[PDB]
Amino acid sequence: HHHHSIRLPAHLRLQPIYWSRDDVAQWLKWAENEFSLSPIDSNTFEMNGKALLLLTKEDFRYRSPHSGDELYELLQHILAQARTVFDLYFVLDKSGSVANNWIEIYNFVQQLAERFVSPEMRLSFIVFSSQATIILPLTGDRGKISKGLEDLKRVSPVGETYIHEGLKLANEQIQKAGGLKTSSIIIALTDGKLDGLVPSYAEKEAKISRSLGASVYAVGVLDFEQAQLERIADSKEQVFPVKGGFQALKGIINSILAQS
Ligand SMILES: [Mg+2]
Ligand SMILES: [Mg+2]
Ligand SMILES: [Mg+2]
Ligand SMILES: [Mg+2]
Ligand SMILES: [Mg+2]
Ligand SMILES: [Mg+2]
Ligand SMILES: [Mg+2]
Ligand code: NA
Ligand code: NA
Ligand code: NA
Ligand code: NA
Ligand code: NA
């Protein structure tokens, strides 16, 4: 049948894997009113969206004898709703300077790759030093992404810090994917210590990214050059320190999700 009209509150339209425990509770309140259900206790599902998605339909029925089957099917319909394809490009400094920090860069990327696993996400991994290389071409195939992560872990840092070459490969793929028609995010991990005219080259390439519609983030490693990262990223609000650990990861995750 094609007579379903499920429109969630705007702030609940993100894929349920990103729902907080409070989001789950709000979804229940919305559903009770939308579907004229009997009262749903606010603690019926004391868990976040990742956990909600592990429950079976039987679990829903046990938790809500009056409404669990309907809520489960509602969730399935929400999961089937089309969401805009979102493309994340990681542009990673493998120069000699960040050699003793490669694992820190890799681990930040792995954490973000593990977060952005909803089916509308596609990831690409690029590394740069004296030359830039696409390690993982843009894809939503989680098997290829896992292989891309294994390849990233084996990188041996060496060479100059020619970040413009890495940004160029993100821009080339964004152009091939549709340019302004795409939803594209670049995440550059670097200390931002650029030599010669590389600052000019990098800022030019980043402005090209923005002319293609992309939003540019910079994650700083080591004693990174904050001002330089601010000129590459869209703004200081899109510059995060890799040293901020979970708080920096949460900050950048929320910022990216808020581009949807
Ligand atoms: Mg509504
Ligand atoms: Mg909104
Ligand atoms: Mg929340
Ligand atoms: Mg029953
Ligand atoms: Mg460097
Ligand atoms: Mg510099
Ligand atoms: Mg999160
Ligand atoms: Na319906
Ligand atoms: Na790969
Ligand atoms: Na793209
Ligand atoms: Na965008
Ligand atoms: Na600027």
Side-chain angles (χ1 to χ4, degrees), residues 57-102 104-153 155-167 169-174 177-180 182-206 208-235 237-242 244-246 248-249 251-253:
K57 189 169 187 177
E58 174 182 75
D59 295 333
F60 270 66
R61 292 200 192 91
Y62 281 152
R63 288 169 170 273
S64 177
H66 289 124
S67 302
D69 51 3
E70 195 271 350
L71 293 168
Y72 179 88
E73 293 302 323
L74 173 59
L75 180 54
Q76 303 318 297
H77 279 255
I78 288 168
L79 292 170
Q81 286 181 323
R83 292 179 176 77
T84 304
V85 174
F86 207 6
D87 301 334
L88 308 179
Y89 296 87
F90 295 88
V91 175
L92 304 177
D93 186 342
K94 65 159 221 68
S95 73
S97 320
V98 304
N100 293 322
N101 293 77
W102 179 252
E104 198 174 32
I105 291 168
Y106 168 79
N107 280 323
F108 195 88
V109 176
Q110 182 186 276
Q111 293 287 333
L112 292 177
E114 289 161 3
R115 166 75 288 188
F116 289 108
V117 298
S118 49
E120 75 278 0
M121 305 302 302
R122 304 189 296 188
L123 306 197
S124 174
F125 304 151
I126 294 151
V127 300
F128 73 87
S129 54
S130 303
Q131 67 176 309
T133 298
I134 293 181
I135 293 305
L136 171 75
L138 185 69
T139 184
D141 184 313
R142 291 188 63 186
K144 295 188 190 167
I145 297 177
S146 299
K147 180 53 169 54
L149 288 169
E150 297 175 6
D151 294 343
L152 275 183
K153 215 172 175 187
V155 166
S156 302
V158 61
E160 305 285 346
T161 312
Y162 293 162
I163 186 164
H164 55 296
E165 299 290 1
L167 294 173
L169 299 183
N171 291 339
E172 286 178 5
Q173 290 187 87
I174 296 166
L180 287 148
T182 70
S183 285
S184 298
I185 306 302
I186 295 165
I187 303 122
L189 276 62
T190 181
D191 60 15
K193 298 186 181 302
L194 311 177
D195 301 317
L197 292 175
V198 177
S200 299
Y201 302 144
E203 291 164 28
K204 285 177 178 195
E205 199 63 28
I208 290 168
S209 304
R210 288 181 271 280
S211 73
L212 289 165
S215 193
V216 187
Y217 289 80
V219 174
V221 188
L222 297 163
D223 288 341
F224 64 90
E225 298 284 344
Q226 172 82 26
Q228 186 56 82
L229 293 203
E230 293 181 8
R231 290 189 300 260
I232 295 165
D234 288 15
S235 85
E237 288 70 27
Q238 300 196 175
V239 175
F240 293 83
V242 85
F246 178 78
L249 275 174
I252 193 165
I253 292 168

Side-chain angles (χ1 to χ4, degrees), residues 7-10 13 30:
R7 182 176 193 86
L8 289 168
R13 291 173 192 171
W30 169 84

Side-chain angles (χ1 to χ4, degrees), residues 14-28 30-79:
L14 19 44
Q15 216 270 358
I17 62 172
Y18 308 114
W19 285 0
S20 70
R21 177 166 162 179
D22 285 339
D23 294 333
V24 170
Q26 297 223 354
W27 169 65
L28 295 172
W30 169 84
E32 181 183 325
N33 177 252
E34 171 66 12
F35 295 109
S36 301
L37 307 175
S38 67
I40 302 174
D41 191 302
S42 60
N43 291 311
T44 301
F45 298 90
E46 292 185 50
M47 69 194 68
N48 64 21
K50 283 187 288 187
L52 189 71
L53 291 167
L54 292 180
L55 298 180
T56 67
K57 189 169 187 177
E58 174 182 75
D59 295 333
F60 270 66
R61 292 200 192 91
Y62 281 152
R63 288 169 170 273
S64 177
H66 289 124
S67 302
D69 51 3
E70 195 271 350
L71 293 168
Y72 179 88
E73 293 302 323
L74 173 59
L75 180 54
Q76 303 318 297
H77 279 255
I78 288 168
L79 292 170

